[PDB]
Structure 1
């Protein structure tokens, strides 16, 4: 069956997102360090400018997934449905533009489904479409909507994203989010493992 709302919320705590173009260091290493530091979920997001393509992209994907497995953390794929199914990913994340959430939900069985939402109505449609969690943002220039969502009684697991750092994360959890997702705060950090750990501890505190 679909993931439980309870387990989904726990997984979103420290949601690390990364592609090879998000770090000048070794990508596979930054991922291993983030997992070792305490990231609770990882999203493979290989896109934008100068991202890996073809076989090179697939190898990074398989290595990133292997690291998630050994660390016991779910592996989530951004956008690519075929890849998610081929690699047997733990789930997929999609945006509003190039994807029909309802059709994706039907194609992935009980895999975790994430959807980027930007409006109150998009949050509601994502849940209705079958999403297990919604990614809301950008929160910062890289929480009022989050507060508004919870105020109405919408209980879908929510993860904040967009310019989140160890110093502005707390307000996102207090607003009602179930976790924070980040890219550079960890991928570009001088000590990725340590950055992940701080986040891990910070979010624990505010959820507790």
Structure 2
């Protein structure tokens, strides 16, 4: 079984983004809130809209803003490269599930040592010096926490990623840039099932 993570695209007004989030929630396993260029005031407004729209809070992951996760009762955070260590986070907030975004074998190895719960590895298909799919396989062999692949994920590339050993994939533009995000998300989950 392979997880599907949806990643918001830091491009839409909160009302539109909120609608899309509510619509796709049963087609994906996790939704990462990654609105880098919005203020905390705007992100809290977004969260208020999806909470009152009935979103299942267990599926939400806050990228980067540990403070917003803490004051919104969101229990999963994704930490970018160069930001807080998982050790600092876990020392004071042991209830948090913690992901690390990593871009090399050695950074993946170090994340497991600092007690991350899982890693996001990419950018897999960006033209990492072409080493994306091979490294994915090397990382999976070397660590024992889950590995989620990100960067250029499309339905036609999922077999390669699956064969390399990924425990799931992460998708941004493939869903949130679609004219029909629900259908877009469905293409991914259908392909994932058909590979079974």
Superposition TM-score, scaled by structure 2 size = 0.86
The 8 Å contact of residues 96 and 117 in structure 1, kept in 2 or not, is answered as yes
Q: Map 1:177-188; keep pairs closer than 5 Å.
A: 177-188=166-177
2:134 to 126, 135, 144: 144
Superposition TM-score, scaled by structure 1 size = 0.82
2:45 to 35, 53, 59: 59
The 8 Å contact of residues 13 and 200 in structure 1, kept in 2 or not, is answered as no
5+ unaligned residues in a row in structure 2: which ranges? 128-132
Runs of 4+ in structure 1 deviating by more than 4 angstroms, as ranges, are 22-25
Q: Say what the alpha-carbon RMSD is for the aligned residues.
A: 2.4
SS of the aligned residue for 2:11 comes to: helix
Q: Map 1:1-208; keep pairs closer than 5 Å.
A: 13-21=3-11, 26-36=16-26, 38-47=27-36, 51-64=37-50, 70-71=55-56, 73-141=58-126, 143-152=133-142, 154-206=143-195, 208=196
* Matched residue count: 191
5+ unaligned residues in a row in structure 1: which ranges? 1-9
Distance 1:71 1:57 in 2: 17
Q: CA deviation at 1:16?
A: 0.3
Bigger shift: residues 14-23 or 75-84:
14-23
Q: CA deviation at 1:107?
A: 2.9
Give the number of the structure with larger relative contact order, counting CA–CA contacts within 8 Å between residues 6 or more apart: 1
The 8 Å contact of residues 105 and 129 in structure 1, kept in 2 or not, is answered as no
SS of the aligned residue for 1:141 comes to: coil
Bigger shift: residues 96-105 or 19-28:
19-28
SS of the aligned residue for 1:134 comes to: strand
